Structures are given as C-alpha cells and as structure tokens.
C-alpha cells in the first residue's frame, strides 16, 4: 500500500507481479481530535511502538521568543493548510494552528519579571499581548500527534502570526 499499482510516468500500466509485502504497510489514518486523552499503541516494524493519539487536549506548547514550554489544554482548532474539513472536524495535525488556554505563559511571565535562562530584552509583540489579554492564543502544532501521541506545539510569532491572522480574515 506504500507500493507500485500506479502508472509508470510514461503513463503505462505496471502489470503487477507481487502481492503486498507487509513492509509496504499503509495502516489507516488516526484522525486525532480534541477531548479527554485517549491513545492506542500500534506495533510498527521491529516492535517499534508508536502512539496513535486519537483524542487530545493537554499538549506541550512552547514560546519560542523566550524558548520555554508549558502544558495547556487546547481549546479550539482554527486553520489547516491541508484542508478546511479537518478544522471543521477539530482534528489535530502537524501544522494545525490552534488556540491554547494561554494563562500559563502569562503566569510564568509574571513570576519571572513584571506583568504581561533569562535573555529578556525582546519583551513581547503587540498582537501577542492583545491575544494574551483575552486569555487564549494562537499556536502551531509541531508533533505529528497521530505518530508521536502528543499535541506538542509552539506559539505563533510576529510575521507568521500576522500571516495566519490574514488567512483567517472574517471579511465576508
């Protein structure tokens, strides 16, 4: 299923002469969603287990500027450069932009210096700040939850963030 059964670039039918060799395995997609955590183990090749997350929430999210990370419930999926169907179904994949319950980062900031190891000097964006004010912040996912079994991700920043906002843009 990872295999041939496909035209030959010249557009000639490869007359098949070989079954399907198990090492051409194409086991089917875990459309991993939001919800309470729930993950199965699929047994890949040499007992190499991999963790089909099927529901998720509490991924590890990073804040790249400051280079730190925190575990947060993720409250909604809002964009998917693959397809809008996935976002409709609220399915987490390796480049989904999603919304983090983003109090943790704020709390961390407060603990460290001010209110909304240390190479601080950068001191936050405007857009990001605004986002924080509502509690909830946009962030890519970066793990492939379907393989790794974790919704690990990172906060979307400056230029990329702007681009994603534009993409989202509402309007009509």
């Amino acid at each position: 299923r990872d295999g041939r059964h496909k035209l030959r670039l010249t557009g000639g039918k490869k007359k098949i002469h070989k079954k399907k060799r198990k090492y051409e395995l194409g086991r089917p997609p875990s459309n991993t969603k939001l919800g309470s955590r729930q993950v199965h183990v699929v047994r890949g090749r040499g007992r190499n287990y991999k963790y089909r997350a099927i529901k998720l929430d509490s991924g590890s999210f990073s804040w790249p500027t400051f280079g730190i990370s925190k575990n947060t419930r993720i409250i909604d999926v809002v964009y998917n450069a693959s397809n809008n169907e996935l976002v409709r179904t609220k399915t987490l994949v390796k480049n989904c932009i999603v919304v983090i319950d983003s109090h943790p980062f704020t709390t961390w900031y407060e603990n460290t210096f001010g209110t909304t190891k240390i190479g601080k000097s950068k001191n936050i964006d405007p857009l990001l700040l605004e986002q924080f004010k509502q509690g909830r912040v946009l962030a890519c996912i970066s793990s492939r939850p379907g393989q790794c079994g974790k919704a690990d991700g990172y906060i979307i920043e400056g230029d990329e963030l702007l681009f994603y906002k534009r993409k989202m843009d509402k309007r009509n």
Binding site: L9, P64, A81, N95, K122, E157, E160, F163
Partner: protein, 146 residues
C-alpha cells in the same frame, strides 16, 4: 511575494529569535550561489537552502523544460556501444530534477545534478550548478555527448 501557499513557508533550520537566514555548502566543490545566501525564497528541497543532502551520483545534463514549479527536465544524451556492429548509437534518458529558484534556467542550459533522496514520484536529483549555454533548434534535439 514569498508566502504563496495556504501554509506559512518558513525555512526549517533558520533559527529566528535567538542566535548570533540558513544555507549550507553541499560539498563536492559546488559553490553555493549568491541567490541562496542572499535573496529570500523558501525551498524544502533546495540543495543549499533546504534540508536535502546531495550524495550518490553527479551527472551533467541539458535542460529540456522549465514548465514544472521549481522543477526541471534534463535529457542525458549518451552512446550505447553495440558489440555486434562494434559501433555506437545515440541514446538518451530524461532525468527530472528539482531546481530551487537560486538558479534561473531557460531551456538548453547545461546543468549538473547531484542525487539526493526521492523528492517525488520521479525526481531523485537536484541541480547544483548551471552552466549557461545557448541552443538554436530544440533542446529535445541537441546531442551533447557529455
């Protein structure tokens, strides 16, 4: 316009926030062009800018097409000896190569391509160095022994 896709075209291996844009050397004496080091453009499968290491064969060709996006065709023209007739005969083979927009390549231009991993259904190569060259018929028809 750099960001043309539905996704943000980033550049893995860049490192934006901390540290003192990303390109690499690719080796075998193929000089990274100015357009890779300068000149923003994101390419996952650029030899220099992206994350594909060229390794295995290197073979010169001659471009037939630019029609695909960031992807080129090169016919290798060569001579298959036939022992019965102790003579040769022109033969050929169209290698598809990935380009990367550091190289502006019109047809008939000589290129050299390194191997690299399977980038798509057929493109296993990428162009490392583009000699200029000029052509008058169709590149299709130019034999250049090489």
């Amino acid at each position: 316009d750099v960001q043309h896709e539905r996704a943000y075209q980033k550049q893995e291996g860049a490192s934006f926030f901390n540290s003192k844009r990303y390109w690499k050397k690719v080796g075998l004496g193929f000089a990274t062009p100015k357009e890779a080091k300068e000149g923003v453009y994101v390419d996952k499968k650029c030899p220099f800018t992206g994350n594909v290491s060229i390794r295995g064969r290197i073979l010169k060709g001659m471009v037939i097409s630019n029609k695909m996006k960031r992807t080129i065709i090169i016919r290798r023209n060569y001579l298959h000896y036939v022992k019965k007739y102790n003579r040769f005969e022109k033969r050929h083979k169209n290698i598809p190569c990935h380009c990367s927009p550091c190289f502006d390549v019109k047809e008939g231009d000589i290129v050299t391509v390194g191997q690299c991993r399977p980038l798509s259904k057929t493109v296993r190569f990428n162009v490392l160095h583009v000699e200029k060259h000029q052509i008058f018929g169709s590149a299709r028809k130019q034999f250049v022994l090489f």
